[PDB]
């Protein structure tokens, strides 16, 4: 009623038992897992993480020595607290910039609330970052907190949770927790980690999340150990507003000490067991007292049992206390599997306490979430970790995780591929180390993990974080061969669409079918049909692509590749793109076999010395793609002569086949006939940007008219200096869009030259087999860290509990101590 109910929508643990997430927990719980041991002897009684000291300080941008100086409590609250957004099926990188609060309760050792900074820090999130000693306090008051900053709108989401590390009320000489049973021996220190993400239930339903259970109010006391903390509960009531004769569970604190058990019992009695059997429960007989973590470990159970029918049974117990045994309670504790008592049509209630040393007592009221009620595609399935090693690890658990289920006696129905993809592709954050395997059904899925997982899959690492598209390179002539657009043509309905669109422009301009060139058993070959059949091509390609959820962050052409790349950045329509290639062609073909090209091994800077120094001016540099390559052209004799001049002085010198001598003195001749001929283009300003190998400067602002064609078949094809002030620019992801590639080695070549990382790739190449069409291409960019708007192909589906990445974790302890 008062207070604003609240979502869990998600959550993460670290527990003994290498319980590391909630279904994990559910089972242990089902199985009736006793976790408390003697005490190990890697550091009598007490339930310890098998490595506290874990850690993965790289993933967060921290050096080991570092890492190794925090709190090992703040360490796994950044782990947990992280597991707790993915689990929520949040993008941790979407969170930045939001008012994401965090709260967060430990043992320390002028407030400074640091452990919930670095996970705010961490997540890059702004809003209240408070943290709270246990000892002065409840373990629920973080979630207390968390719940009432919701509520004030100071948070739109909130983490909250606690930690507890041992580092060494009386305890039980046992060493168990025998609940409320007249054992009653005491209680026993544990670890853990827990943190529940948290959010405003109306915000949550309409944001569409998956609620696991809801908050409904909580309440905060101070006791001057207590039977007064009978108001605790009904001011918690009141808050969320529901009559305690519809709550058929209660996760009391129970310690299990003879002072407070029955103190306990004899309080709660006052409320709950009215009416119907409320069960009692404490899952500290299971784990024991996690300090800090006790409180939202508790609320974890609840959450589980909320979802679930059946409710865990308590440990270590037959027979309540002689004297808090004669009450005509409702309460009673399960010592088996019992289902829920409530058929009434009324939503499952549980509550939850945790009381303080100081005399702080925390009470929580929850509720059930509300109810909300061809094959054989391929879909892609981003798998991604911190490491190699970690992503080996998380490919096999994912395996495992899939063949888990999908069998009777197991969780019977089939895992929805369609709702994993969707989940690892749109609800998941993504990590350094990355594949992504290509299935259409489960077979296929797991054998793409295994490989990974053993080793036969080589991972590819990120060089840039989803924030920009990739480069489109449009490379020239050359790439053609036969059949190249069939397969596309019947997988791709985009590619098949551009091109369709494509098939009368072409027709009227060059009088021949682009689509039957695509088609045919032989490849392409005619000065009016090769360049103008390539360009149709790239600009289906990169409309493809786009249908795919992937635009590009920049293009660069590369002689008459810069024609579609002025189309796909929208500096030129489609029909003036057309009227470009065309018309080049058809007067390019006035002058075909007059002149040479030859490729040299040399500096751009050496050939035009070597040329000046010799006087040689019916020759001049054609192309400069790579630093240390470059493509010379001119008259034939000349060109020749130079070839034999470098081979003689050991220099690699060869002449490459064209129809015409393009970007050199030979087609001078047709240069005011393609003036005339492109006099009424109507270019615009290119929507992406556009580093032009054609202008002295690649940044320079292109006019993409006549005389800028007539330039760019008659100047120097500057591509090497253009994919140098992309690098500059900061992008990292360039990908070929072609038949074949042509230029995706110069590229490397000049990144190469100025020590700058890049991933490159081809949409295309010869008798590429492409069942699934560029689907792969999809996955390589985006495994390369290329943005993909992955909503275009998973517009919809189910958020699925897939297993979280496993962590890069290495022993970080500070020595002497």
Known sequence: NCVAPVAIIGMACRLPGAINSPQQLWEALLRGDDFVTEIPTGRKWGAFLDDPAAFDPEFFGITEREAAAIDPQHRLLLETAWEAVEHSGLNPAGLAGSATG????????????????????????????????????????????????????????ALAGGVSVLLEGMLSPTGHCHAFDTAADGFVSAEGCVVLTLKRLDDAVADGDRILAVIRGTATNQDGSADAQAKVYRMALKAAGVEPGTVGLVEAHGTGTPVGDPLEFSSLAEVYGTDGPCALGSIKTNFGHTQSAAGALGVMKAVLALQHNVIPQNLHFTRLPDQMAEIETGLFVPETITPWPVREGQPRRAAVSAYGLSGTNVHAVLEQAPES??????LVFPVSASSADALRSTAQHLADWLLRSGDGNGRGPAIDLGDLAYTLARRRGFRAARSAVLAGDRGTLVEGLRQIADGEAMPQQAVTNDDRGPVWVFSGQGSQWASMGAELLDREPAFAAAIAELEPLIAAESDFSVTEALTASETVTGIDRVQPTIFAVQVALAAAMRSHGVVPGAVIGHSMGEVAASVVSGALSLEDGVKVICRRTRLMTRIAGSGAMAMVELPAQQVLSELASRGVDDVVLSVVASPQSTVVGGATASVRELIEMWESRGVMAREIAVDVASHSPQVDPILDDLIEALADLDPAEPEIPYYSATLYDPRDYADYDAYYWADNLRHTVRFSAAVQAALEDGHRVFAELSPHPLLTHPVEQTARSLDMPLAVFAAMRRQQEMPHGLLGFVADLHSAGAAVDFSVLYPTGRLLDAPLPAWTHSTLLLDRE
Do not use: Q
């Open 102 to 157: 965090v709260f967060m309760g430990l043992t320390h050792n002028t407030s400074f609330s640091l452990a919930s900074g670095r996970i705010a820090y961490a997540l890059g999130v702004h809003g209240p970052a408070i943290t709270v000693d246990t000892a002065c306090s409840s373990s629920l008051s973080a979630i207390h907190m968390a719940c009432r900053s919701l509520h004030d709108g100071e948070s739109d989401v």
């Open 373 to 378: 009620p061809k094959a054989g595609n391929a």
